[PDB]
């Protein structure tokens, strides 16, 4: 029970890539993110704001990750994760007036592990203009999801498909959707 | 299908009434399976499954360590939480309500924070039976959303009104359909 | 700067 | 950025005295404040270690302050002998790494 | 006890030093620093096991470090120069890198021209 619920310090590596993910967490949001590869603090508070994030405390601790990581692969005799089945859901951030700006949203849930191919599909051809998606936020479940976006302009002729890949899937999972 | 292995470690702090009960909580995870947790309330590392048994155990052999996780939940949570209430603490987008028939949907969009109280009104008396909620839906952008639908049989010229309120709002908003 | 918890290694 | 500075570079002073020494970091956004010792041919020692959250240290005939606010930890050493001269290095930690003083040194004369 | 060989090196303006670090058995957490005359140590590099994890410290790419299996450290020093002079440091911790480090006595490097 608490009116708030933070997660300063959301660390992730798995041994797939080799990949990790740092993420700092308010109420479920994600406020910033530290890349990895490119060792930089990237931002997600929708303000403006002055502060400062060195990433190398990140670099840092997901390094402690990894060398946790092989002694517990050890220790378990190399028990792996299990792919569960991740459930899509395709939906508009406002009601849909045709001809007006709008963003379509979708949300896979109950992703582990944390490796997914989400793209979008106007009329069977891949999107790639107006798409971006969020890190992978962590549920309470120990689990994931993840949220892609692709602000367009409703009409009645264009449909859209949101396609989800996962080990999880025997199949890759398309999620329809119609203005 | 290919196996991987994942670690995961959470550092969680839990608000109560501002800073006045903190509780930080750090969770180390192996594969969704949490195996070691600091919690602020214990003092002291435990082990959550048989993996942590000799880790809980090495951590909580050096002093250092449990002194470091003691002083987190003032070095890390309420730190942090000074900053929150000059950024997120103060951010208040206004819902965008809107009705639509189909059966009555009231579609409050794009709002933050996610405390709301919507309400469906016939004729100026409030609706209760056929009123079908959806549960919270974050939009993941800081934003939120939730439809409310009222089953209706419209007759005459019935006024419906969807009443809204919400923390950024003063005065309510009242959106009604003739 | 935001402050954030630290993790610690297990005995190799 | 991030500077820590200590004030007395060298203290000569006789036995059974009580000395102070402080320290002074620029920055306030620090995970950790820390004393230690470097004597010739071992290198250093720890001393003392305050967290974020503390304004004192003590232990033994060693007493550390600790304002974060204002840069500033002051280290008191009472009744000196002649074994703790050393030159006693201050160090803040930066979540990152460790950012040294320059150091203070202590020859405690019999 | 953390030990360091050798105590002292001598070279001239262009020649390959190493620099050897035992660290305390059990501890997988170690440090390079490097500490010039009248001054405090100078962060290095940083091994969390056999993988650096930070190496922000290191001066150069004539400067590597490396510890393949978790304990032994050598800091490779190739083409060296006059401002390489100086005593570099090595710690170890049980802990993560704000924890408790224990140092050695150092390596008095001295690169003459």
């Known amino acids: 029970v608490a009116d708030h619920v933070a997660s300063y310090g959301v660390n992730l590596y798995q041994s797939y890539g080799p990949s990790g993910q740092f993420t700092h967490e308010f109420d479920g949001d994600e406020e910033f993110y530290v890349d990895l590869e490119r060792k930089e603090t990237v931002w997600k508070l929708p303000l403006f704001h002055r502060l400062r994030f060195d990433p190398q405390f990140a670099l840092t601790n997901i390094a402690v990750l990894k060398h946790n990581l092989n002694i517990l692969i050890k220790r378990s005799n190399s028990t792996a994760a299990t792919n569960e089945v991740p459930e899509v859901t395709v939906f508009s951030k406002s009601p849909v007036t045709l001809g007006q700006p709008n963003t379509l949203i979708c949300l896979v849930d109950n992703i582990f592990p944390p490796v997914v191919n989400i793209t979008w599909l106007s009329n069977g051809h891949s999107v790639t203009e107006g798409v971006s998606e969020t890190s992978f936020l962590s549920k309470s479940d120990h689990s994931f999801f993840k949220i892609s976006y692709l602000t367009f302009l409703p009409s009645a002729d264009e449909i859209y498909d949101c396609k989800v890949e996962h080990w999880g899937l025997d199949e890759p999972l398309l999620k329809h959707w119609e203005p | 299908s290919p196996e991987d292995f994942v670690y995961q470690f959470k550092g969680m702090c839990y608000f109560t009434n501002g800073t006045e009960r903190v509780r930080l909580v750090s969770r180390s995870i192996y594969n969704r399976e949490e195996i070691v947790r600091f919690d602020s309330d214990v003092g002291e590392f435990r082990a959550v499954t048989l993996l942590g048994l000799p880790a809980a155990e090495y951590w909580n052999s050096q002093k250092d360590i449990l002194e470091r996780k003691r002083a987190a939940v003032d070095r890390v949570c309420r730190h942090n939480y000074q900053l929150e209430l000059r950024t997120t603490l103060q951010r208040r987008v206004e819902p965008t309500v809107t009705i639509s028939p189909s059966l009555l949907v009231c579609s409050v969009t794009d709002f933050y924070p996610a405390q709301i109280k919507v309400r469906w009104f016939r004729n100026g008396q409030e609706e209760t039976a056929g009123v079908v909620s959806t549960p919270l839906i974050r939009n993941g952008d800081w934003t939120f959303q939730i439809l409310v639908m009222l089953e209706m049989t419209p007759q005459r010229g019935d006024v419906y009104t969807c009443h809204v309120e919400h923390p950024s709002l003063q005065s309510p908003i009242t959106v009604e359909w003739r | 700067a935001p402050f954030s918890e630290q993790e610690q290694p297990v005995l190799g | 950025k991030q500077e820590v500075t200590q004030i007395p570079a060298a203290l000569s002073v006789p036995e059974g005295e009580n000395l102070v020494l402080n320290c002074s970091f620029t920055d306030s956004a620090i995970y950790n404040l820390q004393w230690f010792r470097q004597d010739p041919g071992k290198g250093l020692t720890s001393l003392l270690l305050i967290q974020s959250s503390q304004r004192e240290q003590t232990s033994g005939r060693l007493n550390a302050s600790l304002d974060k606010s204002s840069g500033r930890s002051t280290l008191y050493i009472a009744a000196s002998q002649p074994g703790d001269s050393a030159t006693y290095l201050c160090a803040v930690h930066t979540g990152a790494r460790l950012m040294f003083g320059d150091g203070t040194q202590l020859v405690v004369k019999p | 006890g953390v030990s360091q060989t050798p105590s002292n090196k001598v070279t001239e303006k262009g020649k390959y030093v190493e620099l050897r670090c035992d660290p305390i058995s059990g501890h997988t957490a170690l440090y390079w620093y490097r500490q010039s005359l009248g001054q405090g140590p100078e962060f290095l590099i940083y091994?969390?096991?056999?993988?650096?994890?930070?190496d922000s410290g290191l001066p150069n790419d004539r400067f590597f470090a490396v510890r393949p299996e978790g304990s032994v450290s050598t800091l490779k020093i190739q083409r060296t120069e006059r401002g390489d002079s100086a005593v570099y440091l090595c710690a170890s911790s049980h802990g993560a890198s704000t924890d408790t480090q224990y140092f050695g006595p150092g390596t008095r490097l001295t690169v003459l021209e």
């Open positions: 091994f969390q096991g056999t993988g650096a994890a930070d």
